[PDB]
Amino acid sequence: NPTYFFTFGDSYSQTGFSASGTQPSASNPMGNPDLGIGTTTNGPNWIGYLTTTENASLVLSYNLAAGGATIDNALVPAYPGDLASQFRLFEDVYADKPASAPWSAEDAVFGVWIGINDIGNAYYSTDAETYTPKLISRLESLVEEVYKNGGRKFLFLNVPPTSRSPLFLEQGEEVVKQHAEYLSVYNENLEGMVDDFTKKKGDVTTVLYDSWSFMTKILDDPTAYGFPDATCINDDGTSCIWWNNYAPGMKYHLLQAEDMKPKLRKLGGW
Numbered sequence: 001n002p003t004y005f006f007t008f009g010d011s012y013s014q015t016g017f018s019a020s021g022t023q024p025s026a027s028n029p030m031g032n033p034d035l036g037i038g039t040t041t042n043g044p045n046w047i048g049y050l051t052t053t054e055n056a057s058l059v060l061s062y063n064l065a066a067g068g069a070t071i072d073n074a075l076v077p078a079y080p081g082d083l084a085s086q087f088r089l090f091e092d093v094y095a096d097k098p099a100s101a102p103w104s105a106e107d108a109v110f111g112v113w114i115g116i117n118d119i120g121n122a123y124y125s126t127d128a129e130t131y132t133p134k135l136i137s138r139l140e141s142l143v144e145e146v147y148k149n150g151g152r153k154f155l156f157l158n159v160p161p162t163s164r165s166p167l168f169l170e171q172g173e174e175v176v177k178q179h180a181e182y183l184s185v186y187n188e189n190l191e192g193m194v195d196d197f198t199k200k201k202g203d204v205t206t207v208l209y210d211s212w213s214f215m216t217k218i219l220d221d222p223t224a225y226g227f228p229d230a231t232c233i234n235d236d237g238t239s240c241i242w243w244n245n246y247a248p249g250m251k252y253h254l255l256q257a258e259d260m261k262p263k264l265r266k267l268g269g270w
Contacts, residue, residue, distance in 0.1 A: 002026070002058040003269035004103035006094065007047050008086045009113035011040045011247055012160075013065035015047060019093045023100050024060035031061065040067075042237030043250035047111070049257035050270070059269040062101065064089055068117055072138045076118040083114050087142045095149040109267045110146050111155040113211075114139065115190070116162050119183050124175075128185035136189045140197060153205045153267050156194050158187040160215040166233055166245040187212055205266055214259050218252070225255060 007013055016038030017031060024031040029051050039045040044052070051061040066081030073082045094101050118135050143154065162168060163180035191208055198206045219230040222241060232240035237249030264270035 002060045002107065003267075004062065004101060004108040005047075005051060005059050005111060005269065006062045006090060006103075006108065007065055007111040007113075008083055008090075009065035009111075009157075010069040010117055011065075011067040012116060013045065013047055013063065013113050014067045015039055015045065015061075015063045015065070017061075017063040019089060024062060026058055026060075029058070029060050030063070039250075039253075040247040041243050041250040041253050042235055044253065045250070046253045046257045046260070049254050050260065050264070053254070054257050054261040054264075054270060056265075056270050057268070060101075062094060065113070069114065070117045070121065071114055071135050071142075075135055075138060076122045078117055078121065083112070083139070083142060087145055091145065091149075095146075097150075105150050105152040107268060108151055109153045109155060109269065110143075110151050111157070112139070112143070113157040115159040115183075115186055119159060119179065119186055120162060120168075123179045123182035128182040132182075132186045132189050135186070136193045139190075140193050143197065147201065147204070152203060154194075155207045155209065155264065155267060156190065157209045157211045158190055159183050160211045161219060162246065164216075164219050164230065165247075166231060166242055169231060170245075183212075207263055207267060209260055209263055211256060214256060215248075215252070218255070226251070 016033050021032030035048050035052055036043045047061055047063050051059040064086040068079040070076045070078045070082050072084045097103055163176045168176050168179055194206055194208045198204055218225045222230045227241050233242040234240040235243055237243050238251040241248050241252050243249035261270050
């Protein structure tokens with residue numbers, strides 16, 4: 001009795017899963033590639049950990065996240081594999097509940113972690129109060145596609161403090177500040193949308209995971225989590241918070257997955 005975990009997002013979530021590669025099964029929950037390959041962490045990322053380490057029951061991972069993704073290239077563009085295109089791949093391959101992935105409302109969880117790149121590309125050129133509602137509205141319309149397919153259990157991660165990634169720190173404290181203020185407005189509107197959606201539908205189970213506060217705790221007191229500082233980069237994924245200048249390593253991702261577990265109990269696989 002598996003949980004079908006369909007995930008959507010950007011480089012913080014990518015694993016290199018192909019819809020034509022080996023598909024998930026009880027013996028191989030990630031499908032492809034091997035657990036620990038294809039990430040920006042030097043090992044498993046939060047999805048790998050949630051599926052194989054923090055799981056309370058069988059979780060099958062269909063990870064449609066793509067590197068550098070924004071929500072919709074008609075708003076803030078970046079790469080072909082925007083969130084809209086990930087939802088289109090879902091519609092093309094999995095939405096009709098094929099025998100390979102015979103999901104139902106009671107056992108499918110749809111996880112979305114998006115916004116890092118929308119904010120990173122638009123924080124200095126747009127007005128957060130009027131522009132982030134347009135991004136959030138497009139996210140909501142994509143979620144509504146999955147709802148119309150019969151999805152009822154949803155996990156949303158808010159945007160973590162990428163303002164404090166080396167990539168932004170090196171741009172100056174006033175740039176960190178401008179980015180952070182924009183991001184805070186985005187995350188507030190994300191919470192408002194998830195709350196409104198949950199109340200309006202009435203038959204969904206939703207989790208909004210506050211990755212921002214969790215990562216911020218670690219950035220504020222890194223040595224309490226086994227990190228020497230909050231700024232170093234190391235591609236071993238464990239010596240520093242940061243695997244490269246913009247994405248955190250596998251140690252961070254495991255700490256986050258462990259923090260997430262209790263909050264995901266209501267979703268069915270944890």
